[PDB]
């Protein structure tokens, strides 16, 4: 019963399956503007990450999900029970990295990864600009732990971006507050604590790096970092738009970019 655990939804028709993973704060409905454009040529599988508001909180193994590997094996188990191989993995934020790690362990399950707002490490290092100094992110988490609803009412507009009181601004706010707070904090400890830079050379399946030109959470430098350190074919396309969830806040300009990168491969 894994399909129930992650609310796996399956539809469309085709020879190769497109898998859709979401990021923190939302769930699979994040892809409302993408699903209809694929179902005429592909099977489409959607799944929620464990911890999302639509999942049973009794299933959030805190020890297992204390690291990205826990979610990576969830994705492998999902793909296995639905008989998915050589899939096209389209992942936003978290799921993109979960997908990338999974493709290292089980390259038989992935043909390519299309990723949006991907981040291999939240904080700045030497040789790496990820947005915020580690010292300061630690305060952003610690204050979120001290006063959860207050500072996430803050956080949510900064992440969605754009005009206040929009569909994406109200949708993300709704799904974000549907998470149980202790689960949300564990997920945040996991994300703010991971560092995938040494893993990137082990990802050798082709990676399409798509990201916003004005994302508070992922600077443009992060995409050129990914493009330079991935172990296989890769490519970068910027989207002239603001926000962390372009696929939801600006579908007219983001969806055709995703489609082209889903449809088309990478030339030598």
Ligand X SMILES: CC1=C[C@H](OC[C@@H]2C(=O)O[C@@H]3c4ccccc4C[C@H]23)OC1=O
Q: Does 109 bind ligand X (CB under 6 A)?
A: no
Identity of the residue, 246 or 251, whose beta carbon is nearer to ligand X in the bound complex: 246
Site residues for ligand X, 218-257, by CB under 6 A, read 244
Q: Is 173 annotated as a binding residue?
A: no
Which run of H or E residues covers position 158? Answer: helix 148-160
Backbone angles phi, psi at 3, to 5 degrees: -55, -35
Q: Is 4 annotated as a binding residue?
A: yes
- Tokens 């979401």 correspond to what residue? 22
Q: Give how many residues touch ligand X by CB under 6 A.
A: 16
Of 16, 57, 62, 77, which lies in the binding site for Cl ion, with binding defined by CB under 5 A? 62
- Cβ-contact 219, 238 below 8 angstroms: no
Q: Does 57 bind Cl ion (CB under 5 A)?
A: no
Q: Does 237 bind Cl ion (CB under 5 A)?
A: no
Q: Does 210 bind ligand X (CB under 6 A)?
A: no
Which of helix, strand or coil describes residue 3? helix
Backbone angles phi, psi at 54, to 5 degrees: -80, 0
Stretch that binds ligand X, among 72-80, 135-143, 173-181, 253-261 (CB under 6 A): 135-143
- Cβ-contact 113, 200 below 8 angstroms: no
Identity of the residue, 150 or 264, whose beta carbon is nearer to Cl ion in the bound complex: 264
Of 87, 176, 191, 207, which lies in the binding site for ligand X, with binding defined by CB under 6 A? 191
Backbone angles phi, psi at 176, to 5 degrees: -60, -45
Q: Rounded distance, CA 180 to CA 87, Å?
A: 31
Write down the least CB distance from residue 84 to ligand X, Å.
22
Q: Rounded distance, CA 247 to CA 146, Å?
A: 31
Identity of the residue, 50 or 191, whose beta carbon is nearer to ligand X in the bound complex: 191
Residues 156/52/32/96 CA torsion (nearest 10 deg): 90
Residues lying near ligand X in the complex (CB under 6 A) are found at: 23-25, 93-94, 119, 122, 137, 140-141, 144, 188, 191-192, 217, 244
Q: Which residues bind Cl ion (CB under 5 A)?
A: 62, 256
Annotated binding site: 4, 7
Annotated binding site for Mg(2+): 4, 7
């Amino acid at each position: 019963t894994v399909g129930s655990a992650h609310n796996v939804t399956v539809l469309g028709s085709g020879e190769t399956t497109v898998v859709l993973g979401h990021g923190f704060g939302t769930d699979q409905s994040v892809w409302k503007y993408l699903v209809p454009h694929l179902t005429d040529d592909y099977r489409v599988l959607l799944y929620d990450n464990m911890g999302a508001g639509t999942t049973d909180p009794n299933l959030y193994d805190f020890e297992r999900y204390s690291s990205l590997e826990g979610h990576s094996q969830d994705l492998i188990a999902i793909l296995e029970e639905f008989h998915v191989t050589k899939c096209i993995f389209v992942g936003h934020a978290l799921s993109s990295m979960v997908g990338a790690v999974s493709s290292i362990f089980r390259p038989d399950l992935f043909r390519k990864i299309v990723m949006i707002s991907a981040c291999p490490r939240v904080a700045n290092a030497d040789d790496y600009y990820g947005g915020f100094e580690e010292e300061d992110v630690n305060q952003l988490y610690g204050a979120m732990e001290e006063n959860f609803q207050t500072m996430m009412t803050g956080y949510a507009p900064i992440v969605v971006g754009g005009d206040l009181e929009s569909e994406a601004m109200q949708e993300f706010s709704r799904t974000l507050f549907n998470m149980r707070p202790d689960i949300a904090l564990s997920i945040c400890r996991m994300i703010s604590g991971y560092d995938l830079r040494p893993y990137l050379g082990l990802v050798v399946i082709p990676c399409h790096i798509i990201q916003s030109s004005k994302d508070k959470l992922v600077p443009v430098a992060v995409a050129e970092y990914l493009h330079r350190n991935f172990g296989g074919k890769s490519v970068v396309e910027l989207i002239p738009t603001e926000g962390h969830l372009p696929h939801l806040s600006a579908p007219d300009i983001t969806i055709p970019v995703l489609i082209r990168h889903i449809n088309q491969d990478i030339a030598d």
